[PDB]
mmCIF file of all heavy atoms in Angstrom:
data_model
loop_
_atom_site.group_PDB
_atom_site.id
_atom_site.type_symbol
_atom_site.label_atom_id
_atom_site.label_comp_id
_atom_site.label_asym_id
_atom_site.label_seq_id
_atom_site.Cartn_x
_atom_site.Cartn_y
_atom_site.Cartn_z
ATOM 1 N N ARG Y 545 -9.768 11.848 5.008
ATOM 2 C CA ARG Y 545 -8.316 11.711 5.022
ATOM 3 C C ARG Y 545 -7.821 10.931 3.814
ATOM 4 O O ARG Y 545 -6.892 11.363 3.123
ATOM 5 C CB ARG Y 545 -7.889 11.042 6.323
ATOM 6 C CG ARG Y 545 -8.072 11.960 7.502
ATOM 7 C CD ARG Y 545 -7.913 11.252 8.822
ATOM 8 N NE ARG Y 545 -8.330 12.126 9.908
ATOM 9 C CZ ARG Y 545 -8.417 11.763 11.179
ATOM 10 N NH1 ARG Y 545 -8.140 10.529 11.567
ATOM 11 N NH2 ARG Y 545 -8.793 12.662 12.084
ATOM 12 N N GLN Y 546 -8.433 9.784 3.536
ATOM 13 C CA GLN Y 546 -8.217 9.078 2.283
ATOM 14 C C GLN Y 546 -9.578 8.679 1.749
ATOM 15 O O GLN Y 546 -10.386 8.087 2.473
ATOM 16 C CB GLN Y 546 -7.309 7.857 2.463
ATOM 17 C CG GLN Y 546 -5.830 8.211 2.468
ATOM 18 C CD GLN Y 546 -5.381 8.851 1.167
ATOM 19 O OE1 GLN Y 546 -6.124 8.870 0.184
ATOM 20 N NE2 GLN Y 546 -4.169 9.395 1.158
ATOM 21 N N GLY Y 547 -9.832 9.017 0.491
ATOM 22 C CA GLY Y 547 -11.192 9.070 0.009
ATOM 23 C C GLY Y 547 -11.868 10.257 0.657
ATOM 24 O O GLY Y 547 -11.332 10.817 1.618
ATOM 25 N N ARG Y 548 -13.026 10.668 0.150
ATOM 26 C CA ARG Y 548 -13.736 11.821 0.693
ATOM 27 C C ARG Y 548 -15.027 11.451 1.402
ATOM 28 O O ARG Y 548 -15.311 11.990 2.473
ATOM 29 C CB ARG Y 548 -14.010 12.836 -0.424
ATOM 30 C CG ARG Y 548 -12.787 13.704 -0.706
ATOM 31 C CD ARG Y 548 -11.779 12.999 -1.601
ATOM 32 N NE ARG Y 548 -10.566 13.788 -1.791
ATOM 33 C CZ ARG Y 548 -9.490 13.706 -1.019
ATOM 34 N NH1 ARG Y 548 -9.444 12.893 0.027
ATOM 35 N NH2 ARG Y 548 -8.431 14.461 -1.300
ATOM 36 N N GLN Y 549 -15.814 10.539 0.839
ATOM 37 C CA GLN Y 549 -16.810 9.817 1.618
ATOM 38 C C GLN Y 549 -16.525 8.332 1.452
ATOM 39 O O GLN Y 549 -16.601 7.556 2.410
ATOM 40 C CB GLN Y 549 -18.229 10.147 1.160
ATOM 41 C CG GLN Y 549 -19.300 9.623 2.103
ATOM 42 C CD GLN Y 549 -19.552 8.136 1.932
ATOM 43 O OE1 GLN Y 549 -19.408 7.591 0.838
ATOM 44 N NE2 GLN Y 549 -19.922 7.470 3.020
ATOM 45 N N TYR Y 550 -16.190 7.954 0.226
ATOM 46 C CA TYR Y 550 -15.556 6.682 -0.096
ATOM 47 C C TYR Y 550 -16.249 5.518 0.619
ATOM 48 O O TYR Y 550 -15.639 4.731 1.342
ATOM 49 C CB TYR Y 550 -14.070 6.765 0.245
ATOM 50 C CG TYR Y 550 -13.182 5.747 -0.429
ATOM 51 C CD1 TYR Y 550 -13.354 5.419 -1.768
ATOM 52 C CD2 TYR Y 550 -12.137 5.152 0.259
ATOM 53 C CE1 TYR Y 550 -12.530 4.505 -2.387
ATOM 54 C CE2 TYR Y 550 -11.309 4.241 -0.355
ATOM 55 C CZ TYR Y 550 -11.509 3.919 -1.674
ATOM 56 O OH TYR Y 550 -10.679 3.007 -2.279
ATOM 57 N N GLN Y 551 -17.563 5.434 0.393
ATOM 58 C CA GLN Y 551 -18.407 4.326 0.861
ATOM 59 C C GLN Y 551 -18.125 3.949 2.316
ATOM 60 O O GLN Y 551 -18.007 2.772 2.667
ATOM 61 C CB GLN Y 551 -18.281 3.104 -0.059
ATOM 62 C CG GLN Y 551 -16.966 2.322 -0.001
ATOM 63 C CD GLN Y 551 -15.884 2.908 -0.884
ATOM 64 O OE1 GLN Y 551 -16.167 3.475 -1.940
ATOM 65 N NE2 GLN Y 551 -14.635 2.756 -0.468
ATOM 66 N N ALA Y 552 -18.045 4.958 3.183
ATOM 67 C CA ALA Y 552 -17.825 4.697 4.600
ATOM 68 C C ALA Y 552 -18.965 3.908 5.236
ATOM 69 O O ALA Y 552 -18.768 3.310 6.299
ATOM 70 C CB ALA Y 552 -17.633 6.015 5.344
ATOM 71 N N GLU Y 553 -20.145 3.883 4.611
ATOM 72 C CA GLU Y 553 -21.281 3.183 5.207
ATOM 73 C C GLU Y 553 -20.967 1.708 5.413
ATOM 74 O O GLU Y 553 -21.311 1.128 6.450
ATOM 75 C CB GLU Y 553 -22.516 3.343 4.323
ATOM 76 C CG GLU Y 553 -22.843 4.781 3.971
ATOM 77 C CD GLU Y 553 -22.308 5.176 2.611
ATOM 78 O OE1 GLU Y 553 -21.075 5.127 2.420
ATOM 79 O OE2 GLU Y 553 -23.119 5.531 1.731
ATOM 80 N N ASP Y 554 -20.308 1.088 4.437
ATOM 81 C CA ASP Y 554 -19.827 -0.288 4.567
ATOM 82 C C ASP Y 554 -18.481 -0.334 3.845
ATOM 83 O O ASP Y 554 -18.414 -0.535 2.631
ATOM 84 C CB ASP Y 554 -20.811 -1.297 3.995
ATOM 85 C CG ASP Y 554 -20.460 -2.719 4.373
ATOM 86 O OD1 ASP Y 554 -19.406 -2.917 5.014
ATOM 87 O OD2 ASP Y 554 -21.233 -3.637 4.032
ATOM 88 N N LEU Y 555 -17.416 -0.140 4.617
ATOM 89 C CA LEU Y 555 -16.077 0.053 4.091
ATOM 90 C C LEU Y 555 -15.214 -1.198 4.205
ATOM 91 O O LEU Y 555 -14.025 -1.150 3.868
ATOM 92 C CB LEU Y 555 -15.416 1.220 4.824
ATOM 93 C CG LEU Y 555 -14.169 1.844 4.203
ATOM 94 C CD1 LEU Y 555 -14.470 2.300 2.791
ATOM 95 C CD2 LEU Y 555 -13.697 3.004 5.056
ATOM 96 N N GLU Y 556 -15.790 -2.316 4.657
ATOM 97 C CA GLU Y 556 -15.021 -3.534 4.890
ATOM 98 C C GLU Y 556 -14.060 -3.828 3.747
ATOM 99 O O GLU Y 556 -12.850 -3.974 3.955
ATOM 100 C CB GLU Y 556 -15.978 -4.713 5.087
ATOM 101 C CG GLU Y 556 -15.299 -5.985 5.565
ATOM 102 C CD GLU Y 556 -14.594 -6.728 4.446
ATOM 103 O OE1 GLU Y 556 -15.078 -6.676 3.295
ATOM 104 O OE2 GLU Y 556 -13.547 -7.352 4.714
ATOM 105 N N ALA Y 557 -14.588 -3.899 2.522
ATOM 106 C CA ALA Y 557 -13.774 -4.306 1.383
ATOM 107 C C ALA Y 557 -12.493 -3.491 1.301
ATOM 108 O O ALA Y 557 -11.415 -4.037 1.037
ATOM 109 C CB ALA Y 557 -14.580 -4.159 0.093
ATOM 110 N N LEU Y 558 -12.587 -2.184 1.550
ATOM 111 C CA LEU Y 558 -11.420 -1.325 1.395
ATOM 112 C C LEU Y 558 -10.250 -1.826 2.230
ATOM 113 O O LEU Y 558 -9.098 -1.792 1.779
ATOM 114 C CB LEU Y 558 -11.770 0.108 1.783
ATOM 115 C CG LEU Y 558 -10.613 1.101 1.676
ATOM 116 C CD1 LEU Y 558 -10.152 1.235 0.228
ATOM 117 C CD2 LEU Y 558 -11.014 2.441 2.256
ATOM 118 N N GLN Y 559 -10.520 -2.296 3.448
ATOM 119 C CA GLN Y 559 -9.437 -2.800 4.285
ATOM 120 C C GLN Y 559 -8.656 -3.879 3.549
ATOM 121 O O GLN Y 559 -7.423 -3.823 3.465
ATOM 122 C CB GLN Y 559 -10.001 -3.326 5.607
ATOM 123 C CG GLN Y 559 -10.477 -2.219 6.547
ATOM 124 C CD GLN Y 559 -10.645 -2.682 7.983
ATOM 125 O OE1 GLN Y 559 -10.436 -1.913 8.923
ATOM 126 N NE2 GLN Y 559 -11.046 -3.937 8.160
ATOM 127 N N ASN Y 560 -9.366 -4.838 2.949
ATOM 128 C CA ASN Y 560 -8.686 -5.861 2.163
ATOM 129 C C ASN Y 560 -7.849 -5.225 1.066
ATOM 130 O O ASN Y 560 -6.689 -5.600 0.862
ATOM 131 C CB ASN Y 560 -9.704 -6.831 1.564
ATOM 132 C CG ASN Y 560 -10.649 -7.395 2.599
ATOM 133 O OD1 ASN Y 560 -10.379 -8.433 3.200
ATOM 134 N ND2 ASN Y 560 -11.771 -6.718 2.809
ATOM 135 N N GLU Y 561 -8.409 -4.238 0.370
ATOM 136 C CA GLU Y 561 -7.630 -3.523 -0.631
ATOM 137 C C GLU Y 561 -6.348 -2.990 -0.015
ATOM 138 O O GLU Y 561 -5.248 -3.220 -0.533
ATOM 139 C CB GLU Y 561 -8.457 -2.381 -1.217
ATOM 140 C CG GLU Y 561 -9.758 -2.828 -1.846
ATOM 141 C CD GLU Y 561 -9.563 -3.325 -3.257
ATOM 142 O OE1 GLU Y 561 -8.431 -3.733 -3.588
ATOM 143 O OE2 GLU Y 561 -10.540 -3.313 -4.033
ATOM 144 N N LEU Y 562 -6.471 -2.313 1.126
ATOM 145 C CA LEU Y 562 -5.293 -1.757 1.770
ATOM 146 C C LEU Y 562 -4.288 -2.849 2.084
ATOM 147 O O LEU Y 562 -3.076 -2.634 1.963
ATOM 148 C CB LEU Y 562 -5.703 -1.015 3.040
ATOM 149 C CG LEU Y 562 -6.557 0.228 2.776
ATOM 150 C CD1 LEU Y 562 -7.133 0.766 4.071
ATOM 151 C CD2 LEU Y 562 -5.767 1.306 2.053
ATOM 152 N N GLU Y 563 -4.772 -4.039 2.446
ATOM 153 C CA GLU Y 563 -3.864 -5.148 2.701
ATOM 154 C C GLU Y 563 -2.976 -5.385 1.491
ATOM 155 O O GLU Y 563 -1.744 -5.413 1.604
ATOM 156 C CB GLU Y 563 -4.668 -6.399 3.050
ATOM 157 C CG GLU Y 563 -5.407 -6.282 4.372
ATOM 158 C CD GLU Y 563 -6.458 -7.354 4.557
ATOM 159 O OE1 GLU Y 563 -6.143 -8.545 4.354
ATOM 160 O OE2 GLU Y 563 -7.603 -7.004 4.914
ATOM 161 N N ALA Y 564 -3.583 -5.489 0.308
ATOM 162 C CA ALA Y 564 -2.788 -5.601 -0.906
ATOM 163 C C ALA Y 564 -1.814 -4.440 -1.001
ATOM 164 O O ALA Y 564 -0.607 -4.634 -1.198
ATOM 165 C CB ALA Y 564 -3.705 -5.646 -2.127
ATOM 166 N N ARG Y 565 -2.316 -3.220 -0.805
ATOM 167 C CA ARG Y 565 -1.439 -2.058 -0.794
ATOM 168 C C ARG Y 565 -0.311 -2.267 0.198
ATOM 169 O O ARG Y 565 0.869 -2.104 -0.134
ATOM 170 C CB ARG Y 565 -2.237 -0.806 -0.438
ATOM 171 C CG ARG Y 565 -3.421 -0.533 -1.348
ATOM 172 C CD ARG Y 565 -2.967 -0.323 -2.776
ATOM 173 N NE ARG Y 565 -2.131 0.867 -2.883
ATOM 174 C CZ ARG Y 565 -2.146 1.721 -3.898
ATOM 175 N NH1 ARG Y 565 -2.947 1.550 -4.938
ATOM 176 N NH2 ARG Y 565 -1.334 2.774 -3.868
ATOM 177 N N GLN Y 566 -0.662 -2.669 1.420
ATOM 178 C CA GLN Y 566 0.357 -2.937 2.424
ATOM 179 C C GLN Y 566 1.401 -3.892 1.869
ATOM 180 O O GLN Y 566 2.606 -3.621 1.927
ATOM 181 C CB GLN Y 566 -0.307 -3.497 3.685
ATOM 182 C CG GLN Y 566 0.630 -4.208 4.633
ATOM 183 C CD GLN Y 566 0.793 -5.674 4.287
ATOM 184 O OE1 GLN Y 566 -0.189 -6.407 4.167
ATOM 185 N NE2 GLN Y 566 2.035 -6.107 4.112
ATOM 186 N N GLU Y 567 0.952 -4.996 1.271
ATOM 187 C CA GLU Y 567 1.891 -5.918 0.647
ATOM 188 C C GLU Y 567 2.724 -5.197 -0.401
ATOM 189 O O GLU Y 567 3.961 -5.214 -0.352
ATOM 190 C CB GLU Y 567 1.130 -7.087 0.026
ATOM 191 C CG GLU Y 567 2.021 -8.165 -0.546
ATOM 192 C CD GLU Y 567 1.247 -9.418 -0.885
ATOM 193 O OE1 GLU Y 567 0.000 -9.367 -0.864
ATOM 194 O OE2 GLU Y 567 1.885 -10.455 -1.167
ATOM 195 N N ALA Y 568 2.057 -4.501 -1.323
ATOM 196 C CA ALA Y 568 2.782 -3.791 -2.366
ATOM 197 C C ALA Y 568 3.770 -2.801 -1.771
ATOM 198 O O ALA Y 568 4.780 -2.478 -2.406
ATOM 199 C CB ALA Y 568 1.797 -3.085 -3.296
ATOM 200 N N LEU Y 569 3.514 -2.324 -0.551
ATOM 201 C CA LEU Y 569 4.504 -1.494 0.124
ATOM 202 C C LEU Y 569 5.834 -2.227 0.208
ATOM 203 O O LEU Y 569 6.829 -1.813 -0.399
ATOM 204 C CB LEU Y 569 4.009 -1.110 1.521
ATOM 205 C CG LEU Y 569 4.771 -0.026 2.297
ATOM 206 C CD1 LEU Y 569 3.980 0.378 3.536
ATOM 207 C CD2 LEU Y 569 6.163 -0.471 2.704
ATOM 208 N N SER Y 570 5.853 -3.351 0.927
ATOM 209 C CA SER Y 570 7.099 -4.070 1.154
ATOM 210 C C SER Y 570 7.828 -4.298 -0.163
ATOM 211 O O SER Y 570 8.948 -3.815 -0.366
ATOM 212 C CB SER Y 570 6.806 -5.399 1.851
ATOM 213 O OG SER Y 570 6.052 -5.195 3.033
ATOM 214 N N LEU Y 571 7.171 -4.989 -1.092
ATOM 215 C CA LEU Y 571 7.747 -5.182 -2.414
ATOM 216 C C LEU Y 571 8.286 -3.864 -2.946
ATOM 217 O O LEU Y 571 9.491 -3.708 -3.174
ATOM 218 C CB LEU Y 571 6.684 -5.750 -3.354
ATOM 219 C CG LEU Y 571 6.410 -7.251 -3.259
ATOM 220 C CD1 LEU Y 571 5.770 -7.615 -1.927
ATOM 221 C CD2 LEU Y 571 5.517 -7.678 -4.405
ATOM 222 N N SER Y 572 7.399 -2.874 -3.068
ATOM 223 C CA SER Y 572 7.770 -1.619 -3.708
ATOM 224 C C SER Y 572 8.990 -0.996 -3.052
ATOM 225 O O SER Y 572 9.776 -0.320 -3.725
ATOM 226 C CB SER Y 572 6.595 -0.645 -3.663
ATOM 227 O OG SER Y 572 5.435 -1.220 -4.235
ATOM 228 N N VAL Y 573 9.169 -1.205 -1.751
ATOM 229 C CA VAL Y 573 10.361 -0.690 -1.091
ATOM 230 C C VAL Y 573 11.508 -1.688 -1.171
ATOM 231 O O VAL Y 573 12.633 -1.317 -1.521
ATOM 232 C CB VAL Y 573 10.035 -0.290 0.365
ATOM 233 C CG1 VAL Y 573 9.717 -1.498 1.233
ATOM 234 C CG2 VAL Y 573 11.193 0.488 0.961
ATOM 235 N N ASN Y 574 11.231 -2.969 -0.915
ATOM 236 C CA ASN Y 574 12.305 -3.954 -0.849
ATOM 237 C C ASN Y 574 13.131 -3.930 -2.122
ATOM 238 O O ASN Y 574 14.366 -3.921 -2.081
ATOM 239 C CB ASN Y 574 11.723 -5.347 -0.614
ATOM 240 C CG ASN Y 574 11.105 -5.492 0.757
ATOM 241 O OD1 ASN Y 574 11.294 -4.642 1.626
ATOM 242 N ND2 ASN Y 574 10.352 -6.567 0.956
ATOM 243 N N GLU Y 575 12.460 -3.904 -3.270
ATOM 244 C CA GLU Y 575 13.168 -3.785 -4.535
ATOM 245 C C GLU Y 575 13.896 -2.451 -4.613
ATOM 246 O O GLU Y 575 15.119 -2.405 -4.799
ATOM 247 C CB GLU Y 575 12.179 -3.932 -5.691
ATOM 248 C CG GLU Y 575 11.359 -5.206 -5.618
ATOM 249 C CD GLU Y 575 12.227 -6.440 -5.507
ATOM 250 O OE1 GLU Y 575 13.311 -6.463 -6.128
ATOM 251 O OE2 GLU Y 575 11.832 -7.381 -4.788
ATOM 252 N N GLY Y 576 13.163 -1.355 -4.424
ATOM 253 C CA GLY Y 576 13.722 -0.031 -4.592
ATOM 254 C C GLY Y 576 15.047 0.118 -3.879
ATOM 255 O O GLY Y 576 16.094 0.252 -4.523
ATOM 256 N N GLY Y 577 15.018 0.036 -2.548
ATOM 257 C CA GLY Y 577 16.255 0.130 -1.794
ATOM 258 C C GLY Y 577 17.323 -0.782 -2.356
ATOM 259 O O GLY Y 577 18.430 -0.342 -2.682
ATOM 260 N N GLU Y 578 16.974 -2.053 -2.560
ATOM 261 C CA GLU Y 578 17.964 -3.006 -3.042
ATOM 262 C C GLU Y 578 18.660 -2.440 -4.270
ATOM 263 O O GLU Y 578 19.892 -2.333 -4.309
ATOM 264 C CB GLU Y 578 17.292 -4.343 -3.365
ATOM 265 C CG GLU Y 578 16.921 -5.180 -2.138
ATOM 266 C CD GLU Y 578 18.090 -5.940 -1.544
ATOM 267 O OE1 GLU Y 578 18.845 -6.581 -2.305
ATOM 268 O OE2 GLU Y 578 18.258 -5.893 -0.306
ATOM 269 N N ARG Y 579 17.874 -1.981 -5.246
ATOM 270 C CA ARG Y 579 18.455 -1.391 -6.444
ATOM 271 C C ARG Y 579 19.494 -0.341 -6.079
ATOM 272 O O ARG Y 579 20.684 -0.499 -6.369
ATOM 273 C CB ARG Y 579 17.357 -0.782 -7.317
ATOM 274 C CG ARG Y 579 16.310 -1.765 -7.836
ATOM 275 C CD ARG Y 579 16.926 -3.020 -8.427
ATOM 276 N NE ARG Y 579 15.915 -4.012 -8.768
ATOM 277 C CZ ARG Y 579 15.343 -4.835 -7.901
ATOM 278 N NH1 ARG Y 579 15.643 -4.802 -6.612
ATOM 279 N NH2 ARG Y 579 14.445 -5.713 -8.338
ATOM 280 N N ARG Y 580 19.068 0.730 -5.408
ATOM 281 C CA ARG Y 580 20.031 1.758 -5.035
ATOM 282 C C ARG Y 580 21.165 1.134 -4.238
ATOM 283 O O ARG Y 580 22.347 1.318 -4.557
ATOM 284 C CB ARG Y 580 19.328 2.874 -4.257
ATOM 285 C CG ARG Y 580 18.746 2.433 -2.935
ATOM 286 C CD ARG Y 580 18.152 3.570 -2.141
ATOM 287 N NE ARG Y 580 17.779 3.125 -0.803
ATOM 288 C CZ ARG Y 580 17.229 3.894 0.125
ATOM 289 N NH1 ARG Y 580 16.961 5.171 -0.100
ATOM 290 N NH2 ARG Y 580 16.946 3.372 1.315
ATOM 291 N N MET Y 581 20.810 0.296 -3.266
ATOM 292 C CA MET Y 581 21.805 -0.397 -2.462
ATOM 293 C C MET Y 581 22.808 -1.104 -3.358
ATOM 294 O O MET Y 581 24.025 -0.943 -3.206
ATOM 295 C CB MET Y 581 21.075 -1.378 -1.548
ATOM 296 C CG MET Y 581 21.897 -2.201 -0.603
ATOM 297 S SD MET Y 581 22.212 -3.768 -1.425
ATOM 298 C CE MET Y 581 21.005 -4.801 -0.605
ATOM 299 N N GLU Y 582 22.305 -1.845 -4.343
ATOM 300 C CA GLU Y 582 23.183 -2.519 -5.287
ATOM 301 C C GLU Y 582 24.187 -1.538 -5.868
ATOM 302 O O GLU Y 582 25.403 -1.696 -5.709
ATOM 303 C CB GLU Y 582 22.347 -3.158 -6.392
ATOM 304 C CG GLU Y 582 21.550 -4.356 -5.929
ATOM 305 C CD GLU Y 582 20.458 -4.727 -6.907
ATOM 306 O OE1 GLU Y 582 20.275 -3.988 -7.896
ATOM 307 O OE2 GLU Y 582 19.776 -5.747 -6.680
ATOM 308 N N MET Y 583 23.686 -0.480 -6.508
ATOM 309 C CA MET Y 583 24.597 0.473 -7.121
ATOM 310 C C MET Y 583 25.534 1.080 -6.093
ATOM 311 O O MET Y 583 26.701 1.343 -6.404
ATOM 312 C CB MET Y 583 23.821 1.558 -7.865
ATOM 313 C CG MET Y 583 23.280 1.091 -9.211
ATOM 314 S SD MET Y 583 21.880 -0.036 -9.131
ATOM 315 C CE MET Y 583 20.580 1.101 -8.674
ATOM 316 N N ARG Y 584 25.069 1.278 -4.858
ATOM 317 C CA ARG Y 584 25.972 1.783 -3.833
ATOM 318 C C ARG Y 584 27.201 0.895 -3.740
ATOM 319 O O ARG Y 584 28.336 1.367 -3.878
ATOM 320 C CB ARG Y 584 25.251 1.873 -2.491
ATOM 321 C CG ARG Y 584 24.223 2.977 -2.463
ATOM 322 C CD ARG Y 584 23.478 3.021 -1.151
ATOM 323 N NE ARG Y 584 22.422 4.024 -1.186
ATOM 324 C CZ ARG Y 584 21.479 4.155 -0.262
ATOM 325 N NH1 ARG Y 584 21.407 3.336 0.775
ATOM 326 N NH2 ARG Y 584 20.583 5.130 -0.386
#
């Protein structure tokens, strides 16, 4: 689904990576909307 085998044998680290991604989600959206919102 994400990655194709992508080191599934020991995938712990990836979760931490996703956490950063998760964080980057909020930022990446919080700014984005705000920008458009601002111009609105």
Side-chain angles (χ1 to χ4, degrees):
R545 289 169 190 174
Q546 278 299 350
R548 279 81 184 91
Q549 191 282 329
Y550 200 42
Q551 72 275 328
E553 307 97 299
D554 192 356
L555 196 56
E556 190 281 327
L558 179 64
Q559 288 197 148
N560 308 270
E561 302 277 23
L562 294 170
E563 293 166 49
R565 304 299 296 218
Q566 162 273 306
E567 185 168 11
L569 191 170
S570 306
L571 280 67
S572 305
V573 68
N574 292 348
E575 306 306 324
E578 285 280 313
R579 298 313 173 280
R580 64 176 188 180
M581 181 265 259
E582 289 164 355
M583 283 73 74
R584 289 178 184 169

